[PDB]
Amino acid sequence: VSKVDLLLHPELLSQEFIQLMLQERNIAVSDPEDRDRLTGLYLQHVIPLPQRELPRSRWGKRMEK
Amino acid sequence: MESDILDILEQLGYDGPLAEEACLLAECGRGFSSSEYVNLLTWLTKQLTQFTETHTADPLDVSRLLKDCCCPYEGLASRLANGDVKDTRDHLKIILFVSSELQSAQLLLSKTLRDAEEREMRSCSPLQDLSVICHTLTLPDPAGRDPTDTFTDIQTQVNVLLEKLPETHIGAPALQRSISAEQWEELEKINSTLSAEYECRRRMLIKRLDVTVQSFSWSDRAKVKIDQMARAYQPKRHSLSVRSSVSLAHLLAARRDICN
Amino acid sequence: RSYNDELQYLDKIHKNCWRIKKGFVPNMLVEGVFYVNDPLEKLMFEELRNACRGGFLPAMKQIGNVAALPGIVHRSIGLPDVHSGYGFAIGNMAAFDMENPDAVVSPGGVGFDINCGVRLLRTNLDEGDVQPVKEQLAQSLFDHIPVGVGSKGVIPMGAKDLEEALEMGVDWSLREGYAWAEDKEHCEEYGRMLQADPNKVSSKAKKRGLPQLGTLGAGNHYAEIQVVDEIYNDYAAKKMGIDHKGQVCVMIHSGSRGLGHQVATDALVAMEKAMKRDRITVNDRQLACARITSEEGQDYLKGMAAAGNYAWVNRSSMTFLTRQAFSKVFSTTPDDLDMHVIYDVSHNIAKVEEHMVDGRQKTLLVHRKGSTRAFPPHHPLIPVDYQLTGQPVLIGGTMGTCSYVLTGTEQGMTETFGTTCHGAGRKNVTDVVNTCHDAGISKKAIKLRPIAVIKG
Amino acid sequence: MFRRKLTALEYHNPTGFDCKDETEFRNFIVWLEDQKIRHYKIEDRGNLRNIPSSDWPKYFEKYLQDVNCPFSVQERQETVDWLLGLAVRFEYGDNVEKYRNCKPVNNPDFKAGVLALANLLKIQRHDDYLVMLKAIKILVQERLTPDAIAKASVTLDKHILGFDTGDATLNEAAQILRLLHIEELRELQTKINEAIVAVQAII
Amino acid sequence: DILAPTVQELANLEREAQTSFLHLGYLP
């Protein structure tokens, strides 16, 4: 419960913690001083997303049943 | 694996008799003997060869494509070339692989085209402004056209909506007095310092929002409703920007209504 | 001292500004001033003459004693409603520079009732619409809001809820759903104080103030409803959301209940002991002062911040209760009624501002007892609506006289550190408002007249 | 190998991916689960998120069985390809029509026209021939739009500039710039209020 | 550290905004 709350808010994370996550996931980092690039990379690759709604295809119908 | 292949075919769109699971299973069990199978393989492989940089469903050609397209299935290429394998599972696997590769190639090409057009838009050129005006005034795209022709077109277009609306709609400019070229450097400096100060103010506002949402996140219900909070907060929050977009063009285009 | 020997120490700068030079009281550090018109001069001078001819010092002498504490910069200021009170005079203003280690805080400077203030709500109805159901509305407001000594808040609370409210403030009230997102915008300090520690509050205060939340209390606290009477600034009134006369508004005047008083007393009892070690002597034993960089000073600052957050939570809860009552009476959603909040000012808080003195920037901790903060237009701590007209200042009076809505000015920011009056005090509210307007420290925009008042 | 499929899904290391690695495979699996598939909730993925534990493969089997994948981890490459195809299919099911049709395959009169257009729309002349063109762009976008045409049917000195540059004509421009900046800041504040309301509506 | 001090840096931002506001139009 703590880890998901930590990963879902890049705004409150420290610079060092964001850099540690980016290095742990083996993500290439350029201009590490700038916060904007680090936040962009974190939002593009690391942040989780909510559950996707069931697709209209047959797989979604099978999953619903 | 029948469901996955049927879903892929429905996504790609097929008018053949493959919409029935039983017919597809029977055709796959038949193997390369069915003309439907070879026709479908040719239909997929022509587009797959068109999409790949290196540019008849005989086993040799499709096996060569599998070798070229970095097909990762264990022994599929060699066994397909030899023809020893006749199991229907191999047929399902090869159909699935080729269809998924075609779908991925289409997605890659579409994303590359979108990125290229976005990069072209990013350039600070009159073309972006002209395209914006033409799109918002239902006019043909001026790109690739004579500039005088497009200018006359937009000129003639503007009046037909000018008189339809009341005259007191556009209004008079708020910047009434004439400004010489000497004062423009000082005006630019004033705009720059104002922009810096208001950027700082905007950043402080965004940080206040950050603190408020952090205080929110410690609620007891905040630990059980993570999905809804993420879905309703991430896209709203990650669209705000600290940069101030006011420029001298806004000053020139400002009308008397903003100065009331 | 002789009366003429006393009055030899007073002079005038201009029509609406006197001046008390050094020597009025021992060990002064800078001259004092006060803003009074002709009617106010008579009252002040009669008080001084009678004092020179009771156990309470005169207002001018209390200004003088305040003008001697270490670290004080610029001049001691007496707003047109200044009158005698415990420690600092009621309506007296003083700012201390944090850079000087000799600077001190004062529990009496902030006040016993920490962070009591006025919040205004606008409503799109008219006087002729409320009047037919005026009695029903008054009864519903009286029954819905628990007002009186010993009354308990209708909504429940516990130790965890109280601790969270002390830590956060309006954020807690807005998270539970008691206040909209707009309420946090139109609040001084944006509704909460950044530095605050609930564990710096004595547990006795927390125990005492647990059932007191949402309760108006006795004294000058009320939740009255009134009608707009006149508009002096059309642009300011339009910005505030009041365009035509006859509009309905509701002001809630409320304090910190028992947390503020208990924090003040528990800080004073230790501050007096710390004074002996700190080697600080002043004219009056009631002027408690210890260094800013001290355990007692920091503890009092944190306790006062927690009391302010509690008072803001109480005011937000009162706003929610009033909104619910109005919605139930008029059978309409409160958002449709446009029951927003114009502003929320606090006149019993000391805050760390960044005024400019003698052309040199300085970070000043400012005590404001009985006086309301005002800021000039374009200040970066005012809502976006009021960035062109200046911060609203609401003169919360009592039953009878009409409350006022002034706005700050550029002159007041550089002259009186952006501070204006906060009521008549223990005088005429109209005279005080006129004195503030003529002195260049405010300008009136709306005048509101009461119809119904809810007291205890 | 998996290069095109990963690139279509916008992977951060399209080339450096290796299927046979131990930790990096789990990192990729968790990235695909929380980014390109999104089956469960964020909080439920915790057991799958824990990378270095020795009990992780059991949760991997549970995840593979839940999505009803025809294969298992006995063939790691098989499941990698199937999951990549599933993610690409999920991305495909947004706009089928547009994705199906993809197939690889200082002038004086300009300045005169811009000047005429600016004169028609009451825009003051400027030294640079591109600034007033941007002015026409903003004006047309703000006023010549379907919403504005559908909705078609205090003095300047009364405001406070907050300072004084000492000029009589630059003061008006400073006031206008201040008003524009205030309007942008108000727009940002409105968005912030909307976000706070949306978040608090859940609780 | 796993978390950053947000309230302190918010106070710093507010102070910086006040300094900029004073420097713009109150400089003698």
Residue numbers in the entry:
A (entry chain F): 18 to 82
B (entry chain D): 1 to 55, 62 to 266
C (entry chain C): 3 to 55, 60 to 432, 476 to 505
D (entry chain E): 1 to 105, 124 to 171, 179 to 228
E (entry chain B): 706 to 733
Give the original sentences from the paper that presented this experimental model.
In archaea and metazoa, tRNA exons are ligated by the RNA ligases RtcB and RTCB, respectively. The metazoan RTCB forms a stable complex with four additional subunits, DDX1, FAM98B, CGI99, and ASHWIN. The RNA ligase RtcB catalyzes the GTP- and Mn2+-dependent ligation of the terminal 2′,3′-cyclic phosphate to the 5′-hydroxyl terminus. Here, we use thiol-based chemical crosslinking to confirm the involvement of specific residues of RtcB in RNA binding, and we present a cryo-EM structure of the purified five-subunit Danio rerio tRNA ligase complex.
We next obtained a 3.3 Å reconstruction of Dr-tRNA-LC-TR, which was used to build an atomic model of the complex. The structure was similar to the AlphaFold 3 prediction with rmsd of 1.8 Å over 964 C-α atoms. In the structure, the enzymatic subunit RTCB forms contacts with every other subunit of the complex except for ASW. As predicted, the C-terminal helix of DDX1 is positioned between the RTCB subunit and the C-terminal α-helix of FAM98B. In the structure, FAM98B and CGI99 form a highly intertwined heterodimer, as confirmed by our coexpression and purification of the human counterparts (His6-MBP-FAM98B and CGI99). In our structure, the C-terminal helical portions of CGI99 and FAM98B dimer interact with the α-helical region of RTCB (residues 340–393). The same part of the CGI99–FAM98B heterodimer binds the ordered N-terminal region of ASW. Moreover, analysis of the electrostatic potential of the surface of the Dr-tRNA-LC-TR (based on our cryo-EM structure) revealed positively charged patches, located near the modeled position of the tRNAIle molecule, as predicted by AlphaFold 3 in the absence of DDX1 subunit. We obtained a medium-resolution single-particle cryo-EM reconstruction of the FL complex and a 3.3 Å structure of its TR version lacking the catalytic domain of DDX1 and unstructured region of ASW.
